[PDB]
Design a protein around this ligand. Structure first.
Ligand SMILES: [Mg+2]
Lengths: 142, 445
Protein backbone atom coordinates (compact mmCIF):
# COMPACT_ATOMS: atom_id res chain seq x y z
CA UNK A 1 0.00 0.00 0.00
CA UNK A 2 2.69 2.52 0.95
CA UNK A 3 4.54 2.16 -2.35
CA UNK A 4 1.19 2.36 -4.15
CA UNK A 5 0.41 5.55 -2.24
CA UNK A 6 3.83 6.93 -3.19
CA UNK A 7 3.21 6.02 -6.84
CA UNK A 8 -0.19 7.72 -6.93
CA UNK A 9 1.15 10.82 -5.19
CA UNK A 10 4.08 11.04 -7.62
CA UNK A 11 1.61 10.82 -10.51
CA UNK A 12 -0.98 13.43 -9.51
CA UNK A 13 0.57 15.48 -6.67
CA UNK A 14 2.26 18.58 -8.09
CA UNK A 15 4.53 19.05 -5.06
CA UNK A 16 6.14 15.58 -5.30
CA UNK A 17 7.82 15.81 -8.70
CA UNK A 18 10.51 13.17 -8.08
CA UNK A 19 10.84 9.83 -6.30
CA UNK A 20 13.61 7.31 -5.54
CA UNK A 21 12.85 3.81 -6.82
CA UNK A 22 14.94 0.65 -6.48
CA UNK A 23 15.28 -2.78 -8.09
CA UNK A 24 11.59 -3.45 -7.41
CA UNK A 25 10.55 -0.76 -9.89
CA UNK A 26 12.98 -1.98 -12.52
CA UNK A 27 10.24 -3.56 -14.66
CA UNK A 28 6.47 -3.65 -15.15
CA UNK A 29 5.57 -0.39 -13.36
CA UNK A 30 3.68 2.10 -15.54
CA UNK A 31 4.17 5.83 -14.93
CA UNK A 32 2.72 7.81 -17.87
CA UNK A 33 3.85 11.08 -16.24
CA UNK A 34 7.54 10.21 -15.77
CA UNK A 35 9.71 11.94 -18.37
CA UNK A 36 13.26 12.12 -16.95
CA UNK A 37 15.26 9.26 -15.48
CA UNK A 38 18.48 9.00 -13.47
CA UNK A 39 20.40 6.05 -12.03
CA UNK A 40 23.17 6.20 -9.43
CA UNK A 41 23.80 2.45 -8.87
CA UNK A 42 23.49 -0.65 -11.03
CA UNK A 43 23.37 -4.43 -10.90
CA UNK A 44 26.73 -5.06 -12.55
CA UNK A 45 26.75 -5.87 -16.26
CA UNK A 46 23.10 -6.72 -16.88
CA UNK A 47 22.06 -5.13 -20.17
CA UNK A 48 18.33 -5.76 -19.61
CA UNK A 49 17.96 -3.70 -16.43
CA UNK A 50 19.10 -0.62 -18.35
CA UNK A 51 16.42 -1.15 -21.01
CA UNK A 52 13.69 -1.97 -18.48
CA UNK A 53 14.56 1.12 -16.44
CA UNK A 54 14.52 3.26 -19.59
CA UNK A 55 11.03 1.90 -20.27
CA UNK A 56 9.59 3.92 -17.38
CA UNK A 57 9.98 7.12 -19.43
CA UNK A 58 9.38 5.69 -22.92
CA UNK A 59 5.61 6.05 -22.37
CA UNK A 60 5.57 9.69 -21.21
CA UNK A 61 2.16 11.27 -21.74
CA UNK A 62 3.44 14.36 -23.58
CA UNK A 63 5.39 12.30 -26.11
CA UNK A 64 3.83 14.03 -29.14
CA UNK A 65 4.10 17.77 -28.41
CA UNK A 66 6.59 19.45 -30.72
CA UNK A 67 10.24 18.96 -29.83
CA UNK A 68 9.71 16.86 -26.70
CA UNK A 69 12.62 14.62 -25.69
CA UNK A 70 12.70 12.47 -22.57
CA UNK A 71 15.99 12.10 -20.71
CA UNK A 72 17.94 9.13 -19.32
CA UNK A 73 21.05 10.03 -17.32
CA UNK A 74 23.70 7.56 -16.12
CA UNK A 75 26.05 8.91 -13.45
CA UNK A 76 29.26 6.86 -13.37
CA UNK A 77 32.53 7.42 -11.51
CA UNK A 78 35.57 7.76 -13.77
CA UNK A 79 38.63 5.51 -13.39
CA UNK A 80 36.50 2.88 -11.63
CA UNK A 81 34.98 -0.50 -12.47
CA UNK A 82 31.61 1.20 -13.00
CA UNK A 83 32.66 2.35 -16.48
CA UNK A 84 33.42 -1.28 -17.34
CA UNK A 85 29.83 -2.20 -16.46
CA UNK A 86 28.34 0.97 -17.97
CA UNK A 87 29.86 0.41 -21.42
CA UNK A 88 28.69 -3.22 -21.10
CA UNK A 89 25.17 -2.68 -19.72
CA UNK A 90 24.10 -0.47 -22.66
CA UNK A 91 25.08 -2.92 -25.41
CA UNK A 92 21.42 -3.86 -25.98
CA UNK A 93 20.07 -0.32 -26.33
CA UNK A 94 22.82 0.38 -28.89
CA UNK A 95 21.64 -2.62 -30.92
CA UNK A 96 18.10 -1.24 -30.85
CA UNK A 97 19.41 2.12 -32.07
CA UNK A 98 19.87 4.30 -28.99
CA UNK A 99 23.13 6.24 -28.70
CA UNK A 100 24.63 7.34 -25.39
CA UNK A 101 26.22 10.79 -25.18
CA UNK A 102 29.21 11.39 -22.90
CA UNK A 103 28.82 14.36 -20.54
CA UNK A 104 32.12 15.32 -18.93
CA UNK A 105 30.75 18.58 -17.38
CA UNK A 106 27.37 20.13 -16.58
CA UNK A 107 27.37 23.81 -17.56
CA UNK A 108 26.19 26.16 -14.82
CA UNK A 109 26.74 23.61 -12.05
CA UNK A 110 29.05 25.82 -9.96
CA UNK A 111 26.65 28.78 -9.58
CA UNK A 112 23.95 26.68 -7.88
CA UNK A 113 23.63 28.17 -4.35
CA UNK A 114 24.33 25.11 -2.18
CA UNK A 115 25.84 21.78 -3.24
CA UNK A 116 26.05 18.65 -1.10
CA UNK A 117 29.54 18.04 0.31
CA UNK A 118 31.10 21.23 -1.05
CA UNK A 119 33.46 21.62 1.92
CA UNK A 120 36.27 19.12 2.63
CA UNK A 121 34.97 18.69 6.19
CA UNK A 122 31.72 17.12 4.96
CA UNK A 123 33.60 15.00 2.42
CA UNK A 124 35.87 13.66 5.16
CA UNK A 125 32.86 12.99 7.41
CA UNK A 126 31.05 11.10 4.65
CA UNK A 127 34.18 9.12 3.77
CA UNK A 128 34.51 7.75 7.30
CA UNK A 129 30.74 7.25 7.53
CA UNK A 130 30.70 4.99 4.46
CA UNK A 131 34.06 3.39 5.30
CA UNK A 132 32.82 2.34 8.75
CA UNK A 133 29.84 0.60 7.13
CA UNK A 134 31.95 -2.59 7.09
CA UNK A 135 2.98 -19.05 38.79
CA UNK A 136 -0.04 -16.85 38.05
CA UNK A 137 0.24 -14.92 41.33
CA UNK A 138 3.96 -14.19 40.82
CA UNK A 139 3.18 -12.34 37.57
CA UNK A 140 3.18 -9.12 39.60
CA UNK A 141 6.95 -9.44 39.99
CA UNK A 142 7.49 -8.93 36.25
CA UNK B 1 46.80 24.99 -51.98
CA UNK B 2 47.72 23.57 -55.39
CA UNK B 3 48.64 26.83 -57.11
CA UNK B 4 49.85 28.17 -53.76
CA UNK B 5 52.27 25.26 -53.31
CA UNK B 6 53.71 25.43 -56.83
CA UNK B 7 53.88 29.23 -56.74
CA UNK B 8 55.53 29.24 -53.31
CA UNK B 9 58.33 26.98 -54.57
CA UNK B 10 58.83 29.19 -57.63
CA UNK B 11 59.25 32.27 -55.40
CA UNK B 12 62.16 30.95 -53.31
CA UNK B 13 64.30 30.27 -56.39
CA UNK B 14 66.93 33.03 -56.85
CA UNK B 15 66.37 35.65 -59.52
CA UNK B 16 69.42 34.56 -61.52
CA UNK B 17 67.79 31.15 -62.05
CA UNK B 18 64.32 32.51 -62.88
CA UNK B 19 65.72 34.40 -65.88
CA UNK B 20 67.11 31.13 -67.27
CA UNK B 21 63.86 29.29 -66.45
CA UNK B 22 61.92 31.41 -68.97
CA UNK B 23 64.00 30.56 -72.06
CA UNK B 24 61.70 27.67 -72.99
CA UNK B 25 58.16 28.79 -73.94
CA UNK B 26 56.70 25.48 -72.72
CA UNK B 27 57.52 26.49 -69.16
CA UNK B 28 56.38 30.09 -69.71
CA UNK B 29 52.95 28.94 -70.89
CA UNK B 30 52.64 26.94 -67.65
CA UNK B 31 53.86 29.60 -65.20
CA UNK B 32 51.48 32.08 -66.84
CA UNK B 33 48.43 29.98 -65.95
CA UNK B 34 49.19 29.82 -62.22
CA UNK B 35 49.03 33.58 -61.58
CA UNK B 36 45.81 35.25 -60.37
CA UNK B 37 43.26 36.29 -63.02
CA UNK B 38 44.21 39.97 -62.77
CA UNK B 39 47.90 39.10 -63.14
CA UNK B 40 47.19 37.23 -66.37
CA UNK B 41 45.11 40.16 -67.64
CA UNK B 42 47.97 42.63 -67.20
CA UNK B 43 50.59 40.18 -68.51
CA UNK B 44 48.62 39.63 -71.73
CA UNK B 45 48.38 43.41 -72.18
CA UNK B 46 52.14 43.98 -71.98
CA UNK B 47 53.25 40.96 -74.03
CA UNK B 48 52.40 42.36 -77.46
CA UNK B 49 53.56 45.98 -77.02
CA UNK B 50 57.28 46.81 -76.96
CA UNK B 51 57.08 49.83 -74.65
CA UNK B 52 57.02 50.72 -70.95
CA UNK B 53 53.71 51.38 -69.17
CA UNK B 54 53.53 53.42 -65.94
CA UNK B 55 52.06 51.64 -62.93
CA UNK B 56 49.35 54.28 -62.50
CA UNK B 57 47.90 53.21 -65.86
CA UNK B 58 47.50 49.68 -64.51
CA UNK B 59 45.83 51.06 -61.38
CA UNK B 60 43.29 52.93 -63.51
CA UNK B 61 41.92 49.70 -65.00
CA UNK B 62 40.82 48.27 -61.64
CA UNK B 63 37.51 49.44 -60.19
CA UNK B 64 37.21 50.66 -56.61
CA UNK B 65 35.61 47.40 -55.48
CA UNK B 66 38.44 45.23 -56.81
CA UNK B 67 41.27 47.40 -55.52
CA UNK B 68 42.31 44.71 -53.03
CA UNK B 69 42.91 42.14 -55.78
CA UNK B 70 45.28 44.58 -57.49
CA UNK B 71 47.64 44.28 -54.49
CA UNK B 72 47.92 40.48 -54.56
CA UNK B 73 48.27 40.42 -58.35
CA UNK B 74 51.16 42.89 -58.41
CA UNK B 75 52.86 41.27 -55.40
CA UNK B 76 52.71 37.77 -56.90
CA UNK B 77 53.84 39.07 -60.30
CA UNK B 78 56.83 40.89 -58.79
CA UNK B 79 57.86 37.94 -56.60
CA UNK B 80 58.60 35.76 -59.64
CA UNK B 81 60.51 38.71 -61.19
CA UNK B 82 58.30 38.51 -64.29
CA UNK B 83 57.59 42.25 -63.96
CA UNK B 84 60.68 44.47 -63.71
CA UNK B 85 60.15 47.85 -61.98
CA UNK B 86 62.30 50.54 -63.62
CA UNK B 87 62.13 54.08 -62.23
CA UNK B 88 63.30 57.05 -64.30
CA UNK B 89 62.30 60.63 -65.10
CA UNK B 90 60.47 60.81 -61.77
CA UNK B 91 58.06 57.98 -62.67
CA UNK B 92 58.05 54.39 -61.41
CA UNK B 93 57.86 52.81 -64.85
CA UNK B 94 56.88 49.15 -65.22
CA UNK B 95 58.11 46.70 -67.86
CA UNK B 96 57.84 42.99 -68.66
CA UNK B 97 60.75 40.56 -68.62
CA UNK B 98 62.27 40.40 -72.13
CA UNK B 99 62.88 36.64 -71.98
CA UNK B 100 59.40 35.93 -70.62
CA UNK B 101 57.96 38.30 -73.23
CA UNK B 102 59.68 36.66 -76.20
CA UNK B 103 58.80 33.16 -74.99
CA UNK B 104 55.10 33.97 -74.64
CA UNK B 105 55.05 35.69 -78.03
CA UNK B 106 56.63 32.59 -79.58
CA UNK B 107 54.10 30.30 -77.88
CA UNK B 108 51.02 32.28 -78.93
CA UNK B 109 52.13 33.24 -82.46
CA UNK B 110 53.73 29.90 -83.33
CA UNK B 111 57.28 31.18 -83.66
CA UNK B 112 60.42 29.10 -83.44
CA UNK B 113 60.15 27.22 -80.16
CA UNK B 114 63.13 24.84 -80.15
CA UNK B 115 60.86 21.84 -79.54
CA UNK B 116 59.72 23.15 -76.15
CA UNK B 117 56.48 21.16 -76.49
CA UNK B 118 58.26 18.13 -77.96
CA UNK B 119 57.65 16.25 -81.19
CA UNK B 120 55.30 13.50 -82.38
CA UNK B 121 56.22 10.02 -83.62
CA UNK B 122 52.64 9.49 -84.90
CA UNK B 123 52.68 5.96 -83.43
CA UNK B 124 49.74 6.16 -81.05
CA UNK B 125 48.91 3.59 -78.38
CA UNK B 126 45.57 2.78 -76.75
CA UNK B 127 44.98 5.18 -73.86
CA UNK B 128 42.25 3.28 -72.00
CA UNK B 129 43.79 -0.20 -72.10
CA UNK B 130 47.45 0.62 -71.40
CA UNK B 131 48.06 4.21 -70.27
CA UNK B 132 45.23 4.17 -67.73
CA UNK B 133 46.24 0.70 -66.55
CA UNK B 134 49.98 1.40 -66.41
CA UNK B 135 49.93 4.57 -64.32
CA UNK B 136 46.93 3.52 -62.23
CA UNK B 137 48.82 0.37 -61.26
CA UNK B 138 52.11 2.25 -60.89
CA UNK B 139 50.42 4.93 -58.78
CA UNK B 140 48.61 2.14 -56.93
CA UNK B 141 51.89 0.46 -55.97
CA UNK B 142 53.38 3.59 -54.40
CA UNK B 143 50.24 4.35 -52.39
CA UNK B 144 49.73 0.75 -51.26
CA UNK B 145 53.32 0.56 -50.04
CA UNK B 146 52.74 3.96 -48.42
CA UNK B 147 49.68 2.77 -46.50
CA UNK B 148 51.61 -0.23 -45.17
CA UNK B 149 49.35 -2.85 -46.70
CA UNK B 150 51.30 -5.96 -47.79
CA UNK B 151 52.03 -6.00 -51.51
CA UNK B 152 53.98 -8.28 -53.84
CA UNK B 153 55.87 -5.88 -56.12
CA UNK B 154 57.58 -3.24 -53.97
CA UNK B 155 58.66 -0.03 -55.75
CA UNK B 156 62.22 0.70 -56.79
CA UNK B 157 64.76 2.31 -54.48
CA UNK B 158 64.41 5.69 -56.23
CA UNK B 159 60.90 6.43 -54.96
CA UNK B 160 61.58 4.43 -51.79
CA UNK B 161 64.59 6.66 -51.11
CA UNK B 162 62.40 9.70 -51.77
CA UNK B 163 59.60 8.42 -49.51
CA UNK B 164 61.81 7.92 -46.45
CA UNK B 165 63.84 11.09 -47.00
CA UNK B 166 60.56 13.02 -46.96
CA UNK B 167 58.47 13.44 -43.83
CA UNK B 168 56.23 10.83 -45.48
CA UNK B 169 56.48 7.29 -44.08
CA UNK B 170 59.01 7.55 -41.28
CA UNK B 171 61.23 4.48 -40.99
CA UNK B 172 63.65 3.04 -38.45
CA UNK B 173 66.13 0.20 -38.89
CA UNK B 174 65.70 -0.84 -35.25
CA UNK B 175 61.96 -1.13 -35.84
CA UNK B 176 62.67 -2.69 -39.23
CA UNK B 177 59.41 -1.36 -40.66
CA UNK B 178 57.80 1.71 -42.23
CA UNK B 179 54.72 3.51 -40.90
CA UNK B 180 52.66 6.52 -41.97
CA UNK B 181 52.84 9.83 -40.06
CA UNK B 182 50.66 12.88 -39.42
CA UNK B 183 51.61 14.42 -42.77
CA UNK B 184 51.26 10.94 -44.26
CA UNK B 185 47.53 10.75 -43.63
CA UNK B 186 47.22 14.36 -44.80
CA UNK B 187 49.01 13.39 -48.02
CA UNK B 188 46.60 10.49 -48.54
CA UNK B 189 43.77 12.97 -47.84
CA UNK B 190 44.80 15.24 -50.74
CA UNK B 191 43.43 15.13 -54.27
CA UNK B 192 45.40 13.45 -57.05
CA UNK B 193 46.72 16.81 -58.27
CA UNK B 194 48.21 17.76 -54.90
CA UNK B 195 49.12 14.14 -54.13
CA UNK B 196 51.37 14.22 -57.21
CA UNK B 197 52.77 17.71 -56.60
CA UNK B 198 53.98 16.75 -53.11
CA UNK B 199 56.17 13.96 -54.50
CA UNK B 200 57.44 16.03 -57.43
CA UNK B 201 58.15 18.99 -55.15
CA UNK B 202 60.07 16.73 -52.76
CA UNK B 203 62.04 15.29 -55.69
CA UNK B 204 63.00 18.83 -56.71
CA UNK B 205 64.53 19.51 -53.30
CA UNK B 206 66.14 16.07 -53.02
CA UNK B 207 68.33 16.26 -56.13
CA UNK B 208 71.83 17.71 -55.78
CA UNK B 209 74.50 18.62 -58.34
CA UNK B 210 71.11 17.71 -62.94
CA UNK B 211 70.10 21.37 -63.06
CA UNK B 212 67.11 22.73 -61.16
CA UNK B 213 65.79 24.49 -64.27
CA UNK B 214 65.97 21.31 -66.38
CA UNK B 215 63.86 19.36 -63.89
CA UNK B 216 61.27 22.14 -64.26
CA UNK B 217 61.67 22.29 -68.04
CA UNK B 218 60.40 18.69 -68.02
CA UNK B 219 57.56 18.81 -65.47
CA UNK B 220 55.97 21.96 -66.90
CA UNK B 221 56.61 20.76 -70.45
CA UNK B 222 55.13 17.38 -69.52
CA UNK B 223 51.87 19.23 -68.94
CA UNK B 224 51.87 20.60 -72.48
CA UNK B 225 51.94 17.04 -73.82
CA UNK B 226 48.59 15.39 -74.56
CA UNK B 227 47.76 11.84 -73.50
CA UNK B 228 47.40 9.01 -75.99
CA UNK B 229 50.15 10.10 -78.37
CA UNK B 230 53.87 9.58 -78.94
CA UNK B 231 56.77 11.99 -78.43
CA UNK B 232 60.20 11.16 -79.84
CA UNK B 233 63.35 11.68 -77.79
CA UNK B 234 66.07 16.45 -75.07
CA UNK B 235 68.53 17.40 -72.34
CA UNK B 236 70.95 14.86 -70.90
CA UNK B 237 69.58 15.35 -67.38
CA UNK B 238 66.06 14.81 -68.73
CA UNK B 239 66.97 11.24 -69.76
CA UNK B 240 67.71 9.84 -66.30
CA UNK B 241 64.97 12.14 -65.00
CA UNK B 242 62.56 10.60 -67.52
CA UNK B 243 63.39 7.11 -66.25
CA UNK B 244 63.07 8.33 -62.66
CA UNK B 245 59.69 9.86 -63.54
CA UNK B 246 58.71 6.44 -64.92
CA UNK B 247 58.61 5.03 -61.37
CA UNK B 248 55.83 7.42 -60.26
CA UNK B 249 53.40 6.43 -63.02
CA UNK B 250 53.74 9.67 -65.00
CA UNK B 251 55.28 8.49 -68.29
CA UNK B 252 54.96 5.06 -69.91
CA UNK B 253 57.83 3.53 -71.90
CA UNK B 254 57.59 0.33 -73.92
CA UNK B 255 61.29 -0.29 -73.25
CA UNK B 256 63.13 5.46 -78.00
CA UNK B 257 59.66 6.97 -77.53
CA UNK B 258 57.89 7.84 -74.27
CA UNK B 259 54.17 8.39 -73.71
CA UNK B 260 52.69 10.68 -71.02
CA UNK B 261 49.80 9.29 -68.99
CA UNK B 262 46.56 10.51 -67.41
CA UNK B 263 48.53 11.83 -64.44
CA UNK B 264 50.77 13.78 -66.83
CA UNK B 265 47.85 15.97 -67.91
CA UNK B 266 46.55 15.91 -64.32
CA UNK B 267 49.48 18.12 -63.24
CA UNK B 268 48.84 21.31 -65.24
CA UNK B 269 45.26 22.25 -64.37
CA UNK B 270 42.23 20.95 -62.51
CA UNK B 271 40.60 17.90 -64.11
CA UNK B 272 27.50 7.17 -56.26
CA UNK B 273 31.11 8.19 -55.57
CA UNK B 274 33.52 5.36 -54.83
CA UNK B 275 34.79 5.59 -51.25
CA UNK B 276 31.57 6.87 -49.70
CA UNK B 277 30.89 5.06 -46.43
CA UNK B 278 28.19 4.90 -43.75
CA UNK B 279 29.00 5.14 -40.04
CA UNK B 280 26.31 4.09 -37.57
CA UNK B 281 25.82 4.80 -33.88
CA UNK B 282 26.99 1.20 -33.33
CA UNK B 283 30.50 2.27 -34.45
CA UNK B 284 30.11 0.20 -37.63
CA UNK B 285 31.48 1.17 -41.05
CA UNK B 286 30.07 0.19 -44.45
CA UNK B 287 32.20 1.53 -47.31
CA UNK B 288 30.76 1.52 -50.84
CA UNK B 289 34.21 1.14 -52.37
CA UNK B 290 35.86 -1.49 -54.59
CA UNK B 291 39.50 -0.42 -54.69
CA UNK B 292 42.42 -1.82 -52.66
CA UNK B 293 43.72 1.72 -52.09
CA UNK B 294 40.59 2.81 -50.23
CA UNK B 295 40.43 -0.45 -48.27
CA UNK B 296 44.06 -0.16 -47.18
CA UNK B 297 43.73 3.44 -45.99
CA UNK B 298 40.53 2.50 -44.15
CA UNK B 299 42.49 -0.28 -42.42
CA UNK B 300 44.68 2.39 -40.78
CA UNK B 301 41.94 3.16 -38.24
CA UNK B 302 39.28 0.50 -38.92
CA UNK B 303 39.05 -3.16 -37.89
CA UNK B 304 37.91 -4.75 -41.14
CA UNK B 305 35.54 -7.68 -40.65
CA UNK B 306 34.62 -8.80 -44.19
CA UNK B 307 34.27 -7.63 -47.78
CA UNK B 308 32.00 -7.96 -50.79
CA UNK B 309 32.59 -6.87 -54.38
CA UNK B 310 30.40 -3.79 -53.96
CA UNK B 311 31.18 -2.71 -50.38
CA UNK B 312 33.38 -3.31 -47.34
CA UNK B 313 32.01 -3.67 -43.80
CA UNK B 314 34.04 -3.20 -40.62
CA UNK B 315 33.86 -1.87 -37.05
CA UNK B 316 35.49 1.09 -35.33
CA UNK B 317 37.22 -0.02 -32.14
CA UNK B 318 39.58 1.40 -29.53
CA UNK B 319 42.40 -0.82 -30.82
CA UNK B 320 42.21 0.56 -34.36
CA UNK B 321 42.02 4.20 -33.23
CA UNK B 322 44.95 3.70 -30.86
CA UNK B 323 46.88 2.04 -33.69
CA UNK B 324 46.29 5.07 -35.93
CA UNK B 325 47.09 7.59 -33.19
CA UNK B 326 50.36 5.84 -32.33
CA UNK B 327 51.40 6.47 -35.95
CA UNK B 328 50.75 10.21 -35.54
CA UNK B 329 47.31 10.42 -37.17
CA UNK B 330 45.27 13.12 -35.45
CA UNK B 331 41.60 12.56 -34.66
CA UNK B 332 40.78 15.75 -36.57
CA UNK B 333 42.08 14.18 -39.77
CA UNK B 334 40.10 10.98 -39.14
CA UNK B 335 36.80 12.83 -38.79
CA UNK B 336 37.72 14.85 -41.88
CA UNK B 337 38.13 11.59 -43.80
CA UNK B 338 34.78 10.30 -42.54
CA UNK B 339 32.95 13.56 -43.27
CA UNK B 340 34.37 14.11 -46.77
CA UNK B 341 33.71 10.44 -47.68
CA UNK B 342 30.17 10.36 -46.29
CA UNK B 343 27.32 8.57 -48.04
CA UNK B 344 24.48 10.68 -49.50
CA UNK B 345 22.05 9.03 -47.07
CA UNK B 346 23.93 10.48 -44.09
CA UNK B 347 23.90 13.93 -45.69
CA UNK B 348 20.16 13.83 -46.41
CA UNK B 349 19.25 12.70 -42.90
CA UNK B 350 21.56 15.33 -41.39
CA UNK B 351 19.91 17.99 -43.55
CA UNK B 352 16.47 16.90 -42.34
CA UNK B 353 17.68 17.04 -38.73
CA UNK B 354 18.91 20.59 -39.33
CA UNK B 355 15.61 21.53 -40.99
CA UNK B 356 13.60 20.31 -38.00
CA UNK B 357 15.95 22.16 -35.64
CA UNK B 358 15.44 25.37 -37.63
CA UNK B 359 11.70 24.66 -37.99
CA UNK B 360 11.12 24.83 -34.23
CA UNK B 361 13.57 27.70 -33.67
CA UNK B 362 15.09 29.54 -36.67
CA UNK B 363 17.10 31.88 -34.42
CA UNK B 364 20.20 29.68 -34.21
CA UNK B 365 21.94 27.92 -37.10
CA UNK B 366 23.41 24.67 -35.82
CA UNK B 367 26.35 23.23 -37.79
CA UNK B 368 25.50 20.51 -40.31
CA UNK B 369 27.11 17.36 -38.89
CA UNK B 370 26.70 14.51 -41.37
CA UNK B 371 27.84 11.74 -39.01
CA UNK B 372 26.65 11.16 -35.45
CA UNK B 373 28.39 13.23 -32.75
CA UNK B 374 28.91 10.26 -30.41
CA UNK B 375 31.53 8.70 -32.69
CA UNK B 376 33.45 11.99 -32.90
CA UNK B 377 33.29 12.44 -29.13
CA UNK B 378 34.46 8.88 -28.47
CA UNK B 379 37.38 9.23 -30.90
CA UNK B 380 38.45 12.49 -29.26
CA UNK B 381 38.08 10.94 -25.81
CA UNK B 382 40.36 8.08 -26.86
CA UNK B 383 42.87 10.71 -27.98
CA UNK B 384 42.63 12.23 -24.49
CA UNK B 385 43.24 8.76 -23.05
CA UNK B 386 46.54 8.73 -24.96
CA UNK B 387 47.29 12.22 -23.61
CA UNK B 388 46.52 11.33 -19.97
CA UNK B 389 50.08 10.88 -18.70
CA UNK B 390 52.33 13.88 -19.39
CA UNK B 391 56.11 13.59 -18.95
CA UNK B 392 58.99 15.96 -19.72
CA UNK B 393 62.73 15.38 -19.69
CA UNK B 394 64.59 17.99 -17.67
CA UNK B 395 66.17 18.94 -14.36
CA UNK B 396 64.92 20.12 -10.97
CA UNK B 397 66.59 23.16 -9.41
CA UNK B 398 66.64 23.49 -5.62
CA UNK B 399 68.69 24.53 -2.59
CA UNK B 400 68.83 28.23 -3.41
CA UNK B 401 70.71 30.46 -0.98
CA UNK B 402 68.40 33.41 -1.63
CA UNK B 403 64.87 34.08 -2.86
CA UNK B 404 66.29 36.69 -5.24
CA UNK B 405 68.46 34.05 -6.92
CA UNK B 406 65.58 31.57 -7.16
CA UNK B 407 63.34 34.21 -8.74
CA UNK B 408 66.16 35.41 -11.01
CA UNK B 409 66.93 31.98 -12.46
CA UNK B 410 63.27 30.92 -12.66
CA UNK B 411 62.21 34.20 -14.30
CA UNK B 412 64.98 33.85 -16.89
CA UNK B 413 63.73 30.35 -17.72
CA UNK B 414 60.22 31.76 -18.14
CA UNK B 415 61.53 34.49 -20.45
CA UNK B 416 63.23 32.00 -22.79
CA UNK B 417 60.28 29.60 -22.59
CA UNK B 418 62.01 26.63 -20.94
CA UNK B 419 60.24 26.73 -17.55
CA UNK B 420 57.78 23.89 -16.93
CA UNK B 421 56.93 24.25 -13.22
CA UNK B 422 57.88 26.32 -10.18
CA UNK B 423 56.88 26.75 -6.54
CA UNK B 424 57.79 29.89 -4.61
CA UNK B 425 57.26 28.26 -1.20
CA UNK B 426 59.82 25.51 -1.86
CA UNK B 427 62.11 27.67 -4.04
CA UNK B 428 62.11 24.88 -6.62
CA UNK B 429 61.46 24.81 -10.36
CA UNK B 430 61.71 22.36 -13.25
CA UNK B 431 63.00 23.26 -16.71
CA UNK B 432 63.01 21.26 -19.93
CA UNK B 433 66.12 19.36 -20.99
CA UNK B 434 66.33 21.62 -24.06
CA UNK B 435 66.92 24.73 -21.95
CA UNK B 436 69.19 23.17 -19.33
CA UNK B 437 72.49 24.44 -20.72
CA UNK B 438 71.20 28.00 -21.18
CA UNK B 439 69.96 28.10 -17.58
CA UNK B 440 73.24 26.65 -16.28
CA UNK B 441 75.28 29.17 -18.27
CA UNK B 442 73.12 32.05 -17.03
CA UNK B 443 73.51 30.78 -13.47
CA UNK B 444 77.30 30.99 -13.68
CA UNK B 445 77.14 34.53 -15.07
MG1 LIG C 1 3.95 -4.26 -19.08
Amino acid sequence: QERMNILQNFQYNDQINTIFLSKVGDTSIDLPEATCLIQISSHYGSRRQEAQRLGRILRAKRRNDEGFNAFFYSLVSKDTQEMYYSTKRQAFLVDQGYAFKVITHLHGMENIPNLAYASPRERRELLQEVLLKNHPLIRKMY
Amino acid sequence: SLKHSVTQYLEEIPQQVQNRLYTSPATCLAIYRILPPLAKFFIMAMVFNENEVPLLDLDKWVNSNGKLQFQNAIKSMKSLHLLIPNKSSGTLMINLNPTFKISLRNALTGGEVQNSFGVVVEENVVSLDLLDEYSANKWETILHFMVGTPLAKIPSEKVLNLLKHSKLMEEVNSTGEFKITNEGFQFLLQEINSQLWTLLLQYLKMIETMDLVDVLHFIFMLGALEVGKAYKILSETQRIMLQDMRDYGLVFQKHSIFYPTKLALMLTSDTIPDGSLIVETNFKIYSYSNSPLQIAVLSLFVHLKARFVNMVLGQITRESIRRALTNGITADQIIAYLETHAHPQMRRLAEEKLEKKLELDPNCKEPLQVLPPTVVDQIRLWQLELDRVITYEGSLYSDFETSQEYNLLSKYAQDIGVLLWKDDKKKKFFISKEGNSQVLDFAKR
